[PDB]
Protein backbone atom coordinates (compact mmCIF):
# COMPACT_ATOMS: atom_id res chain seq x y z
CA UNK A 1 0.00 0.00 0.00
CA UNK A 2 1.04 3.64 -0.39
CA UNK A 3 -0.10 7.01 0.80
CA UNK A 4 0.29 10.60 -0.31
CA UNK A 5 -1.11 13.99 0.94
CA UNK A 6 -0.25 17.20 0.56
CA UNK A 7 0.90 19.70 3.22
CA UNK A 8 0.50 23.43 3.50
CA UNK A 9 2.19 26.15 5.16
CA UNK A 10 0.47 27.40 7.77
CA UNK A 11 1.40 31.01 6.86
CA UNK A 12 3.41 33.49 4.97
CA UNK A 13 6.75 32.68 6.20
CA UNK A 14 6.51 28.65 6.33
CA UNK A 15 6.46 28.80 10.31
CA UNK A 16 5.47 25.38 9.93
CA UNK A 17 3.25 22.99 7.84
CA UNK A 18 0.20 20.85 8.04
CA UNK A 19 -1.31 17.87 6.38
CA UNK A 20 -4.50 16.62 6.82
CA UNK A 21 -5.55 13.54 8.65
CA UNK A 22 -8.57 11.07 8.96
CA UNK A 23 -8.86 9.82 12.45
CA UNK A 24 -12.00 7.93 13.53
CA UNK A 25 -15.16 6.48 12.15
CA UNK A 26 -16.81 8.65 10.95
CA UNK A 27 -13.67 10.07 9.16
CA UNK A 28 -12.98 13.17 11.79
CA UNK A 29 -9.91 14.81 9.82
CA UNK A 30 -7.52 17.11 11.37
CA UNK A 31 -5.12 19.72 9.82
CA UNK A 32 -1.41 17.93 11.61
CA UNK A 33 1.94 18.81 11.47
CA UNK A 34 4.01 16.10 10.77
CA UNK A 35 7.42 16.11 12.61
CA UNK A 36 10.44 13.97 12.29
CA UNK A 37 11.82 15.40 15.28
CA UNK A 38 9.49 13.36 17.59
CA UNK A 39 7.01 10.73 17.88
CA UNK A 40 3.71 11.30 19.15
CA UNK A 41 0.70 11.06 17.63
CA UNK A 42 -1.21 13.74 19.66
CA UNK A 43 -4.59 15.86 18.80
CA UNK A 44 -6.73 18.47 20.26
CA UNK A 45 -10.08 16.89 21.46
CA UNK A 46 -12.52 16.95 23.49
CA UNK A 47 -10.66 16.51 26.40
CA UNK A 48 -8.49 19.59 26.32
CA UNK A 49 -8.64 22.05 28.57
CA UNK A 50 -11.66 24.37 27.11
CA UNK A 51 -9.61 27.77 28.22
CA UNK A 52 -6.84 26.18 25.90
CA UNK A 53 -8.86 25.45 22.73
CA UNK A 54 -9.06 28.98 20.45
CA UNK A 55 -10.42 28.03 17.16
CA UNK A 56 -8.38 24.24 16.45
CA UNK A 57 -10.61 21.60 15.00
CA UNK A 58 -11.18 18.91 17.85
CA UNK A 59 -11.05 14.91 17.91
CA UNK A 60 -14.05 13.84 19.77
CA UNK A 61 -13.63 10.04 20.61
CA UNK A 62 -17.14 9.16 21.74
CA UNK A 63 -18.23 9.99 18.06
CA UNK A 64 -15.51 7.31 16.58
CA UNK A 65 -17.18 3.98 16.64
CA UNK A 66 -13.59 2.74 16.07
CA UNK A 67 -12.34 4.41 19.14
CA UNK A 68 -11.04 2.66 21.99
CA UNK A 69 -9.58 4.18 25.37
CA UNK A 70 -6.42 2.66 26.27
CA UNK A 71 -6.51 2.11 29.40
CA UNK A 72 -4.08 3.82 32.09
CA UNK A 73 -1.88 5.49 29.48
CA UNK A 74 -1.18 8.54 29.78
CA UNK A 75 1.73 10.91 27.90
CA UNK A 76 3.80 14.15 28.46
CA UNK A 77 5.87 15.82 25.97
CA UNK A 78 8.16 18.79 25.42
CA UNK A 79 9.32 20.20 22.62
CA UNK A 80 12.88 21.48 21.75
CA UNK A 81 11.14 25.24 21.47
CA UNK A 82 9.90 24.80 25.33
CA UNK A 83 6.18 24.24 23.99
CA UNK A 84 4.26 20.89 25.88
CA UNK A 85 1.16 18.70 26.28
CA UNK A 86 0.08 16.28 27.92
CA UNK A 87 -3.24 13.74 28.34
CA UNK A 88 -4.47 10.18 27.57
CA UNK A 89 -4.56 7.70 24.69
CA UNK A 90 -6.92 6.49 22.46
CA UNK A 91 -6.25 3.67 19.50
CA UNK A 92 -8.35 4.80 16.21
CA UNK A 93 -7.99 4.09 12.76
CA UNK A 94 -6.10 6.75 10.74
CA UNK A 95 -5.57 7.73 7.36
CA UNK A 96 -2.81 9.55 5.65
CA UNK A 97 -3.46 10.40 2.27
CA UNK A 98 -5.45 6.89 1.09
CA UNK A 99 -3.18 5.01 3.88
CA UNK A 100 -4.98 3.59 6.40
CA UNK A 101 -3.70 2.29 10.16
CA UNK A 102 -5.84 0.62 12.13
CA UNK A 103 -5.21 0.23 16.12
CA UNK A 104 -3.01 3.89 15.95
CA UNK A 105 -2.13 5.14 19.61
CA UNK A 106 -4.35 8.53 19.26
CA UNK A 107 -3.01 10.59 21.68
CA UNK A 108 -5.62 13.00 23.69
CA UNK A 109 -4.86 16.12 24.76
CA UNK A 110 -6.08 16.86 28.45
CA UNK A 111 -3.56 20.17 28.19
CA UNK A 112 -1.28 22.54 25.67
CA UNK A 113 0.97 25.09 26.39
CA UNK A 114 0.22 28.58 24.84
CA UNK A 115 1.99 28.52 21.64
CA UNK A 116 -0.12 25.39 20.70
CA UNK A 117 -3.27 27.38 22.04
CA UNK A 118 -1.91 30.64 19.80
CA UNK A 119 -2.18 28.44 16.91
CA UNK A 120 -5.48 28.01 15.64
CA UNK A 121 -3.96 26.20 12.31
CA UNK A 122 -2.42 23.46 13.80
CA UNK A 123 -4.92 20.54 15.40
CA UNK A 124 -2.06 18.24 16.87
CA UNK A 125 1.21 17.08 15.62
CA UNK A 126 2.46 13.88 14.09
CA UNK A 127 5.36 11.94 14.87
CA UNK A 128 7.74 10.42 12.45
CA UNK A 129 10.71 10.27 14.68
CA UNK A 130 11.49 6.78 15.91
CA UNK A 131 9.12 5.01 18.26
CA UNK A 132 11.75 5.05 20.76
CA UNK A 133 11.15 8.51 21.59
CA UNK A 134 7.14 7.60 22.21
CA UNK A 135 6.04 8.86 25.49
CA UNK A 136 3.15 7.35 26.41
CA UNK A 137 3.59 5.45 29.63
CA UNK A 138 3.29 3.07 30.86
CA UNK A 139 3.62 0.99 27.15
CA UNK A 140 5.13 3.12 24.90
CA UNK A 141 3.27 2.81 21.75
CA UNK A 142 4.59 3.21 17.75
CA UNK A 143 4.25 5.98 15.46
CA UNK A 144 1.62 6.13 12.25
CA UNK A 145 4.99 5.15 9.94
CA UNK A 146 5.88 2.23 12.14
CA UNK A 147 2.38 0.77 12.28
CA UNK A 148 2.41 1.53 8.95
CA UNK A 149 5.82 0.02 7.72
CA UNK A 150 4.81 -3.79 6.99
CA UNK A 151 2.24 -3.07 4.66
CA UNK A 152 3.90 -0.05 2.82
CA UNK A 153 4.84 -1.05 -0.68
CA UNK A 154 8.63 0.47 0.43
CA UNK A 155 9.52 1.01 3.94
CA UNK A 156 10.34 4.85 3.78
CA UNK A 157 8.07 7.83 3.52
CA UNK A 158 9.17 11.29 1.72
CA UNK A 159 8.82 14.74 2.64
CA UNK A 160 9.07 17.46 0.06
CA UNK A 161 8.44 20.72 1.25
CA UNK A 162 7.47 23.35 -0.58
CA UNK A 163 8.68 27.04 -0.60
CA UNK A 164 6.01 29.76 0.48
CA UNK A 165 3.70 26.72 -1.67
CA UNK A 166 1.59 23.35 -0.64
CA UNK A 167 4.13 20.35 -0.82
CA UNK A 168 3.68 16.32 -0.53
CA UNK A 169 4.03 13.54 2.44
CA UNK A 170 4.41 10.36 0.10
CA UNK A 171 4.43 6.93 2.30
CA UNK A 172 5.71 3.53 0.65
CA UNK A 173 7.29 5.20 -2.46
CA UNK A 174 9.16 7.77 -4.12
CA UNK A 175 7.81 9.41 -6.65
CA UNK A 176 10.89 9.79 -9.91
CA UNK A 177 9.32 12.40 -10.90
CA UNK A 178 9.64 14.71 -8.01
CA UNK A 179 13.38 15.65 -8.29
CA UNK A 180 15.79 16.31 -10.83
CA UNK A 181 19.31 14.42 -10.75
CA UNK A 182 19.86 11.76 -8.19
CA UNK A 183 19.19 10.90 -4.89
CA UNK A 184 21.98 11.18 -2.64
CA UNK A 185 21.86 8.91 0.83
CA UNK A 186 23.28 9.11 3.73
CA UNK A 187 23.94 6.99 6.86
CA UNK A 188 21.53 7.94 9.83
CA UNK A 189 22.10 6.94 13.70
CA UNK A 190 19.01 6.29 15.59
CA UNK A 191 21.07 5.94 18.88
CA UNK A 192 19.38 9.14 20.15
CA UNK A 193 16.00 8.61 18.27
CA UNK A 194 16.43 10.69 15.40
CA UNK A 195 17.07 11.04 12.26
CA UNK A 196 20.46 12.02 12.82
CA UNK A 197 23.08 12.31 10.14
CA UNK A 198 25.79 13.37 9.01
CA UNK A 199 26.56 16.30 6.84
CA UNK A 200 29.80 16.56 4.56
CA UNK A 201 30.62 20.49 4.59
CA UNK A 202 28.77 23.92 3.70
CA UNK A 203 29.65 26.68 1.52
CA UNK A 204 28.10 30.16 1.22
CA UNK A 205 26.85 31.86 -1.56
CA UNK A 206 29.14 31.20 -4.40
CA UNK A 207 32.54 30.53 -1.82
CA UNK A 208 34.23 27.86 -1.67
CA UNK A 209 33.38 24.70 -0.22
CA UNK A 210 34.18 23.63 3.01
CA UNK A 211 34.44 20.05 3.78
CA UNK A 212 33.74 19.38 7.41
CA UNK A 213 31.15 17.22 9.21
CA UNK A 214 28.23 18.65 10.45
CA UNK A 215 26.25 16.00 12.93
CA UNK A 216 22.58 17.04 13.19
CA UNK A 217 19.08 15.70 12.73
CA UNK A 218 16.51 16.06 9.66
CA UNK A 219 13.18 17.47 11.69
CA UNK A 220 10.66 18.96 9.77
CA UNK A 221 9.01 20.27 12.98
CA UNK A 222 11.71 22.71 13.68
CA UNK A 223 11.13 26.01 11.38
CA UNK A 224 15.04 27.24 10.91
CA UNK A 225 18.56 25.68 10.30
CA UNK A 226 20.53 25.55 13.19
CA UNK A 227 24.12 25.13 12.59
CA UNK A 228 28.04 25.42 14.41
CA UNK A 229 27.96 28.98 15.93
CA UNK A 230 31.25 29.00 13.12
CA UNK A 231 29.17 28.22 10.49
CA UNK A 232 26.48 30.73 10.92
CA UNK A 233 29.17 33.59 11.47
CA UNK A 234 30.43 32.67 8.31
CA UNK A 235 27.23 33.39 6.34
CA UNK A 236 26.41 36.03 8.31
CA UNK A 237 29.44 37.33 7.62
CA UNK A 238 28.63 38.06 4.21
CA UNK A 239 25.54 39.97 4.92
CA UNK A 240 25.88 43.90 5.75
CA UNK A 241 24.28 44.89 8.78
CA UNK A 242 23.59 42.01 9.91
CA UNK A 243 24.16 41.26 13.63
CA UNK A 244 23.50 38.73 16.22
CA UNK A 245 20.97 40.46 18.91
CA UNK A 246 19.92 38.59 22.22
CA UNK A 247 17.26 41.00 23.07
CA UNK A 248 15.77 39.43 19.69
CA UNK A 249 17.42 35.91 19.97
CA UNK A 250 19.27 35.53 17.16
CA UNK A 251 20.53 37.13 14.00
CA UNK A 252 18.65 39.68 12.37
CA UNK A 253 19.70 41.45 9.13
CA UNK A 254 18.49 45.11 7.38
CA UNK A 255 15.50 43.98 5.72
CA UNK A 256 16.95 46.12 2.31
CA UNK A 257 19.20 43.30 2.43
CA UNK A 258 19.74 40.68 -0.33
CA UNK A 259 20.50 37.08 1.18
CA UNK A 260 22.85 35.06 -0.23
CA UNK A 261 22.48 31.35 -0.92
CA UNK A 262 23.63 28.59 1.45
CA UNK A 263 24.62 25.54 0.39
CA UNK A 264 25.27 21.95 2.88
CA UNK A 265 26.81 18.70 1.41
CA UNK A 266 25.44 15.33 1.44
CA UNK A 267 28.07 13.34 0.89
CA UNK A 268 29.63 14.05 -2.64
CA UNK A 269 26.27 16.25 -3.40
CA UNK A 270 25.62 19.80 -2.55
CA UNK A 271 22.17 21.16 -1.66
CA UNK A 272 21.26 24.78 -2.05
CA UNK A 273 19.47 27.04 -0.28
CA UNK A 274 18.08 30.15 -2.08
CA UNK A 275 18.75 33.14 -0.34
CA UNK A 276 15.31 33.71 -0.07
CA UNK A 277 14.60 30.86 1.60
CA UNK A 278 16.63 32.34 4.80
CA UNK A 279 14.46 35.58 4.73
CA UNK A 280 11.64 35.27 7.68
CA UNK A 281 10.32 39.09 7.80
CA UNK A 282 10.46 41.87 10.11
CA UNK A 283 11.48 40.89 13.20
CA UNK A 284 7.92 42.96 14.35
CA UNK A 285 5.14 44.13 12.11
CA UNK A 286 6.68 47.33 9.98
CA UNK A 287 10.79 46.56 11.08
CA UNK A 288 12.77 47.30 9.25
CA UNK A 289 14.78 44.53 10.99
CA UNK A 290 14.48 40.77 9.58
CA UNK A 291 14.97 37.71 10.94
CA UNK A 292 18.00 34.93 9.77
CA UNK A 293 16.78 31.76 8.81
CA UNK A 294 20.34 30.47 9.56
CA UNK A 295 20.53 30.38 13.66
CA UNK A 296 23.29 29.31 16.15
CA UNK A 297 22.68 25.59 17.70
CA UNK A 298 25.26 26.73 20.32
CA UNK A 299 23.56 25.83 23.67
CA UNK A 300 20.31 23.64 22.06
CA UNK A 301 22.88 20.75 21.81
CA UNK A 302 22.18 19.54 18.70
CA UNK A 303 22.61 20.74 15.19
CA UNK A 304 19.23 21.02 13.26
CA UNK A 305 18.36 20.93 9.72
CA UNK A 306 14.79 22.18 9.82
CA UNK A 307 12.15 23.32 7.35
CA UNK A 308 14.64 26.14 5.87
CA UNK A 309 16.79 23.35 4.52
CA UNK A 310 14.52 20.45 4.17
CA UNK A 311 12.28 22.52 1.69
CA UNK A 312 15.18 23.04 -0.79
CA UNK A 313 15.14 19.30 -1.04
CA UNK A 314 13.21 16.17 -1.63
CA UNK A 315 13.95 13.74 0.68
CA UNK A 316 13.80 10.67 1.78
CA UNK A 317 12.95 8.96 5.30
CA UNK A 318 14.28 5.42 4.50
CA UNK A 319 12.94 2.92 7.44
CA UNK A 320 14.33 -0.32 6.25
CA UNK A 321 16.20 -2.16 8.85
CA UNK A 322 19.45 -0.63 8.23
CA UNK A 323 18.01 3.45 7.58
CA UNK A 324 19.37 6.21 5.53
CA UNK A 325 18.34 9.56 4.86
CA UNK A 326 18.07 10.67 1.09
CA UNK A 327 18.49 14.02 -0.45
CA UNK A 328 18.06 14.92 -3.95
CA UNK A 329 17.82 18.52 -5.59
CA UNK A 330 14.41 19.52 -7.12
Known amino acids: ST ?15 ITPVQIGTPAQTLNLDFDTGSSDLWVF ?36 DGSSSSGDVYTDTVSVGGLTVTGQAVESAKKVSSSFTEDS ?24 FDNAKASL ?16 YNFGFIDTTA ?33 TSIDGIADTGTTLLYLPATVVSAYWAQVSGAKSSSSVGGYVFPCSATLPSFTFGVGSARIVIPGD ?3 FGPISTGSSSCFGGIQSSAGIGINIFGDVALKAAFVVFNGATTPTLGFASK
Request: no cysteine; glycine share 10%; charged share 15%.
Open 3 to 17: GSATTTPIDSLDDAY
Open 45 to 80: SSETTASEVDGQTIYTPSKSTTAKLLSGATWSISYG
Open 121 to 144: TIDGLLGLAFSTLNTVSPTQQKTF
Open 153 to 168: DSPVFTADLGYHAPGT
Open 179 to 211: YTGSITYTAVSTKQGFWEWTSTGYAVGSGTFKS
Open 277 to 279: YID
